[PDB]
From a paper:
The enzymes of the fumarate respiration are anchored in the inner mitochondrial membrane where complex I (NADH-rhodoquinone reductase) acts as a proton pump that is driven by the oxidation of NADH to NAD+ and coupled to the reduction of rhodoquinone (RQ) to rhodoquinol (RQH2), while complex II, serving as a RQH2-fumarate reductase (QFR), transfers electrons from RQH2 to fumarate. In contrast, mammalian complex II catalyzes the reverse reaction in mammalian mitochondria, where it acts as succinate-ubiquinone reductase (SQR) in the aerobic respiratory chain. Since fumarate respiration is the major pathway of energy metabolism during adaptation to a hypoxic environment for many species of parasites including adult A. suum and bacteria inhabiting anaerobic environments as well as some human cancer cells exposed to low nutrition and low oxygen conditions, the pathway is one of the most promising targets of chemotherapy for both parasitic diseases and cancer. In spite of the similarity in amino acid sequences and three-dimensional structures between A. suum QFR and porcine SQR, flutolanil specifically inhibits the enzymatic action of A. suum QFR.
Since it is highly restricted in its freedom of conformation due to the planar peptide linker, an investigation into the effect of a linker with higher rotational freedom on its potency was considered. Two very promising hits, NN23 and NN28, were found. On the other hand, NN28 inhibits less effectively A. suum QFR (IC50 = 0.028 μM) and surprisingly it is virtually no longer effective against porcine SQR (IC10 > 90.0 μM). NN28 is bound to A. suum QFR in a similar manner to NN23; all interactions including electrostatic interaction between the trifluoromethylbenzene ring and the guanidino group of Arg 76C, hydrogen bonds to a fluorine atom of the trifluoromethyl substituent and the carbonyl group of the linker donated by Arg 76C, Trp 197B and Tyr 107D are observed. Conversely, the model structure of the porcine SQR-NN28 complex speculated from the experimentally determined structure of A. suum QFR-NN28 complex reveals that the chlorine atom at the 2′-position of the dichlorobenzene group collides with Ile 43C (1.79 Å). The covalent bond connecting the dichlorobenzene group and linker was rotated in order to avoid the dichlorobenzene group and Ile 43C collision, the result was a further collision of the chlorine atom with Trp 35C, Ile 30C and Trp 173B, one after another. Therefore, the model structure suggests that NN28 is unable to bind the porcine SQR. On the basis of this structural investigation, flutolanil analogues showing higher potency and specificity toward A. suum QFR than flutolanil were found. These inhibitors, NN23 and NN28, possess high conformational flexibility as a result of the –CO–NH–CH2– linker and are able to bind to A. suum QFR without causing the energetically unfavorable strain in the enzyme as shown by X-ray crystal structure analyses.
Residue numbers in the entry:
A (entry chain B): 33 to 282
B (entry chain D): 28 to 156
C (entry chain C): 34 to 186
D (entry chain A): 30 to 645
Amino acid sequence: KRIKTFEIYRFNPEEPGAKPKLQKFDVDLDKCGTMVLDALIKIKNEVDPTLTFRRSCREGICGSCAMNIAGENTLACICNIDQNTSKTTKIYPLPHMFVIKDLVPDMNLFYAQYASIQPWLQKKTKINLGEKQQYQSIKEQEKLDGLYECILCACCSASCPSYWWNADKYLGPAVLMQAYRWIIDSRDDSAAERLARMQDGFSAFKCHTIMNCTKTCPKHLNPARAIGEIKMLLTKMKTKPAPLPTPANF
Amino acid sequence: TSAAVTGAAPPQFDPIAAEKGFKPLHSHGTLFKIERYFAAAMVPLIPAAYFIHGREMDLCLALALTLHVHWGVWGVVNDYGRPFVLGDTLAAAVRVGAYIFTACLLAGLLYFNEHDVGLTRAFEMVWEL
Amino acid sequence: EKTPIQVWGWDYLMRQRALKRPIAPHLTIYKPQMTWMVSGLHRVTGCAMAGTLLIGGVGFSVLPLDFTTFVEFIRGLGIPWVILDTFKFIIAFPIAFHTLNGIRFIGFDMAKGTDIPSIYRGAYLVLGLAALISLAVVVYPRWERHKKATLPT
Amino acid sequence: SNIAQYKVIDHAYDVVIIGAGGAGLRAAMGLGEAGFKTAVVTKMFPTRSHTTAAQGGINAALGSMNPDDWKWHFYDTVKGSDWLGDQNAMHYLTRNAVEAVTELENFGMPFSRTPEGKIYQRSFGGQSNNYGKGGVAKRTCCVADRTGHSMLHTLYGNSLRCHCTFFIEYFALDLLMDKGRCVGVIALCLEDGTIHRFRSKRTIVATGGYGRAYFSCTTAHMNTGDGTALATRAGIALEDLEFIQFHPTGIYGVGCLITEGSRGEGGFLVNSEGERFMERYAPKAKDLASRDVVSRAETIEIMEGRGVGPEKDHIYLQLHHLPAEQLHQRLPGISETAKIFAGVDVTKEPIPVIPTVHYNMGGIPTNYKAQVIKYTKEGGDKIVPGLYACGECACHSVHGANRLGANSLLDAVVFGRACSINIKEELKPDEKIPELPEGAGEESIANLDAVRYANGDVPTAELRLTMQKTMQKHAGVFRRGDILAEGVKKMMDLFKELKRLKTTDRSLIWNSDLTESLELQNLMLNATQTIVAAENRKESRGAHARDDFPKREDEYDYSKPIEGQTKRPFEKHWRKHTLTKQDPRTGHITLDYRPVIDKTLDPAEVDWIPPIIRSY
Ligand SMILES: Cc1cc2nc3c(=O)[nH]c(=O)nc-3n(C[C@H](O)[C@H](O)[C@H](O)COP(=O)(O)OP(=O)(O)OC[C@H]3O[C@@H](n4cnc5c(N)ncnc54)[C@H](O)[C@@H]3O)c2cc1C
Ligand code: HEM
Ligand SMILES: O=C(NCc1ccc(Cl)cc1Cl)c1ccccc1C(F)(F)F
Ligand code: SF4
Ligand code: F3S
Ligand code: FES
């Protein structure tokens, strides 16, 4: 029988003055699904129901199962199990996050920071909601490709050592890409004010171009490229283009 | 039992309600620009300093390094000199130490260029060993 | 001054402090990669140099000893050329690598070459040239000093 | 409450919404625009909601690709329902589709584009131009392969503007009822273990489906039918629960969805003879036939030995004949989901797929205004004051016996919006927030404590497994009276084994053992009612297919000309919604039946659509 072992970070906040720990669990690979989430679920159901972690989608689209596996921040539901049984796989929560319990981090600063970018379409001329479609060209909307895909899982932010030390002031790669997703949207008028919110020395400029964000992103996105692009804009080295004019027969 | 007490809404960041009074323009963008231009400008200066030597390269190096290092340590201090881990006043002290650090650096290099072999010469003498 | 979110973020931290909650492991657990090790090196080299310039300039002033009589002291320790030329490499590399990697990081700052293939080639490319240059600068002159020890004329 | 101490916390709101998917968030936006102090209770961060897993698109007659008409969409919606759908609601759905999807765009949703600069539409299963006489329709608007992801994120983003106050990772336990009215919700805060009672003038149940009743599904682990369970405990009968959508293409081994949009872009099903077999089971529409007809087609091909792969138990979905530029542009998400889960380069090898449990056209019965209802055969539909429901957890019924593809996101946004429109107009600012009755939510805490400290010998994960396994075997794609009745037997015994429940995690702070048990209780209430309704129904309509009753039993024989026949009485025929009253304590289920609404909202605007033979 093929027995893989996992070293899972544990922490119980209800125990008197408890400390975090590492717990080893053995799993028969032949009575378990191919992905690391499968292992966690099996262990939870067949050994230890106190094992606590987030999951929802089984296909890597929700972002719930973000955690640190084998040293990298990834999604448990699409990371395959390393079948070399002589190795143990270490599973920690998202790095440098405050931990509620086990592999479940507190996520509300991440989310708060996501709100602060005003992630919604803005227009300087009030529009009748139901009435008509806004014009956007295939080229213009393709600038969103590589930006809207983001499932908002936090992997990249929790891989960023700048965001480790200064989460309170540096918005981090996840939010910064999303900010830029509303800046290069050609249907959006507030490009100017969006950049205005992250003018200061920490909001965006505390990105020290480390590149962990782009390496680790499990959706194969590139936030470093988007942060770089925001810097170019903040330094007036580039501008946002004007919307391609809306044709007469539209 | 349900003999409860009335509760408040959770911490939640209202992005609109935080938009009333937030005008201030403090654009760090222009500074971030010159920092990198200055770095790029130093690119040729380093091999220049390999070939040409003397008391004025010693002086150009002294200046540009001092300035570029001032901007550097400032950021390194701003990364690690965190009030969450140091409290507010020790953080301020470290920020101040970035300026003390720049000022001793220059004074130390000026001294060295003026009462000693100087930067380039001093490199020659270790590369003769 | 702070942006509103940065004020909210402080209060958030103070809340988390108050809830006696642990911080998830970071340096101790994160897989070393060419991305964050090289950044770490760029900083280490950058800082190490300044520190040497400070302990140098301020050092030789405050002390009675000067740099000429220092070089004499270590010269008179009669230590082998292989070891001396290593120390010279160790001195050239910080400067070489940092200067090279410096220009790579400005590229990143302009959204240039930020894909993982490029990130990884850049990292290797810069570690390479820096070692080549450091070695060039130590060895070539030492090779001239052998072309003088044993030579016609 | 007997054993432990629970910290109860009271809150007062104009409207509480249980849910944060399409329906939930669209409703919050409407209500917050309309001024109301709104509270959104969701057991997971809204972006993690299942809406985000949606792929294929959202229907609206925008006519970006060719001329279109919302009435043509209405036709297909009704025909899709196999005339179990309430036509007043299917009217409202389609009449509003253009507006709703346009709004979504205006909100910033990054729809894929036509060269003209308009919203790209694709073809999809079960839709046609011209009242079923013209060609294949192209109503299905999309952000490529991730329409649900992009819609939910856009909606969520826009909900940070309505000053709506989110309670995230709160597990809704029950509705707060006071003499047949819904004054609130009671829930549990995962973060800290505290119990929360929400007083509210209104209450919108927007909780999504119950796909995890079965053993294999495309749904999330969070699709446990909590809302329907909530309703059952409130003493509200559920509607049409036997109508379970099996989606034709879910990845063979693992259950992950491959969108119907992959067919509608040119892909097709192939059996082990290398034959495009859908040309037999449906000559006109071939691979784009309705969802229930295709899933039955595959299921037969398996049963008659034509199945594919080592065990000959699934079939192939072929896409590799399409250009690699189309696959990357139209289907990037599944192009990748196939690589990760099936190890398949979709541009060369086909995807191993097989019908998989997917949608729930059943749910909480409502009128066309999304107001929950009880039904007496004398007093008719009687609304439940204070209670609305929408999205998948609801049953309007816009889907009847078979949901049309890309009609769900549409359903959720339309009727989610509809709730706010209706509450704006019926709720007025003199009326004040209801005071809770005494000891409110006390039994909800009693159940919590009991399950938290449950001491039995059957542990929560085994029971769910045998529920899932049972439901899979008996209430399947093809069902029979003896199997059904044997299944009903097994399930009613599993409901008893619920008293022998073991849990282990005794904590209150983020206890995923405790909630997954609460979820199991809920899942049992949905599953039991699903199978008893499925057993009694002696006909074959939509996704419900009885081998021992293969014909759709209407008031007439709509295969023969209508005039010169006599109306069968309500009790003999089966064009009628199934209602399932369940006692949550005993588990006993009574049955009743409710007439299908055939009128439209306005005959002047559009005529109703008399039943015909359903042939794709
Ligand atoms: C894989 C897949 C792909 C699909 N693709 C498409 C498509 O392309 N087009 C289309 O039209 N339809 C599609 N559907 C169908 C459609 O996406 C869903 O039916 C629809 O999104 C449901 O929306 P909803 O808001 O009703 O529920 P959901 O979107 O599932 O949201 C449910 C909400 O209820 C909350 N909730 C549940 N229980 C509790 C509780 N106890 N307490 C508090 N909150 C609770 C959850 O936290 C969540 O926020 C797809 C379905 C699946 C499974
Ligand atoms: C000659 C060309 C040089 C270039 C192009 C260059 C470039 C850079 C850049 C781009 C940074 C910012 C990195 C960040 O913020 O993440 C930086 C930081 C720094 N540089 Fe240089 N540099 C050069 C020479 C030097 C020299 C000679 C020293 C000598 C002491 C030095 C010391 C530093 C220090 C201390 C930092 C601190 C910030 C950090 O570690 O990230 N640099 N340099
Ligand atoms: O701290 C950094 N990297 C992580 C790290 C911390 C401590 C050590 Cl000893 C080593 C490394 Cl790599 C870092 C490095 C270069 C630039 C910026 C940072 C920082 F501050 F942003 F995180
Ligand atoms: S970018 Fe990649 S990693 Fe960062 S959040 Fe969006 S998805 Fe998760
Ligand atoms: S990991 Fe961090 S500093 Fe910048 S480019 Fe990547 S975000
Ligand atoms: S559980 Fe959905 S991202 Fe893994």
